[PDB]
């Protein structure tokens, strides 16, 4: 019950487009770090574990890093389908708990 | 085949109860730990339970603590929670998830998601 601060609460971006997701660890936590996208409507997916690894499947422009308390989720050249919100969780301690959320929207006009 | 199938939410008005079941498939319930975790209509994700089913330990999270019990029948590979005493701020999509396996606690697969409405 160390507890995660998600930034930004939305951004929204382009088709090509860089981005970044933060959270920190209000303690360390070490790299106890997992990283979820959720669609409306359906449930969590995993995509990152131990901060840094790609779970089986996961697109590879997707990828984690830590530094300190401080954990960053990069997905170098946004596709259609990763417009969705990003979760990042700890499981360090009970209970595990999760960000706010980023919903990673496409600037229309 | 590994899926966790939810079941069990519906409409219930303040203080009354509810059942809902995760089913195992492809694996077995027995081996890892089970977390149920909700999501509230506007808000975001919210663990609040966990159970080992070999040796029976649950924890749970404090606005559940008393009030819900979560269980595992691992003949039948599926876990349970039993949610009596309910406030309107329990209305959430309930989802049940696993730890994948030994140094793999993240949670890598989850359920569909069940909706548990509590409204008079």
């Known amino acids: 019950d160390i507890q995660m601060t998600q930034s930004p609460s939305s951004l929204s971006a382009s088709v090509g487009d860089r981005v970044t997701i933060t959270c920190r660890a209000s303690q360390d936590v070490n790299t106890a770090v997992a990283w979820y996208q959720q669609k409306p409507g359906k449930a969590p997916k995993l995509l990152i574990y131990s901060a840094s690894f790609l779970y089986s499947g996961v697109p590879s422009r997707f990828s984690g890093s830590r530094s300190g308390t401080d954990f960053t989720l990069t997905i170098s050249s946004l596709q259609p389908e990763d417009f969705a919100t990003y979760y990042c969780?700890?499981?360090?301690?009970?209970?595990?708990?999760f960000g706010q959320g980023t919903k990673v929207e496409i600037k229309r006009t | 085949e590994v899926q966790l199938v939810e079941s069990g939410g519906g409409l219930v008005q303040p203080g009354g109860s509810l059942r809902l079941s995760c089913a195992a498939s492809?694996?077995?319930?027995?081996?890892?730990?089970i977390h149920w975790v909700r999501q509230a209509p506007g808000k975001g994700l919210e663990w609040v339970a966990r159970?080992?089913?070999?040796?029976?330990?649950?924890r749970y999270a404090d606005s559940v603590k008393g009030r819900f019990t979560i269980s595992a029948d691992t003949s039948k590979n599926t876990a349970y929670l039993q949610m009596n005493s309910l406030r309107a701020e329990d209305t959430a999509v309930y989802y049940c998830?696993?730890?994948?396996?030994?140094?793999?606690?993240?949670?890598?697969?989850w359920g569909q998601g069940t909706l548990v409405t509590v409204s008079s």
């Open positions: 159970i080992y089913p070999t040796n029976g330990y649950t």
């Open positions: 998830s696993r730890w994948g396996g030994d140094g793999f606690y993240a949670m890598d697969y």
């Open positions: 492809g694996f077995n319930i027995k081996d890892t730990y």
């Open positions: 969780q700890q499981h360090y301690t009970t209970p595990p708990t």
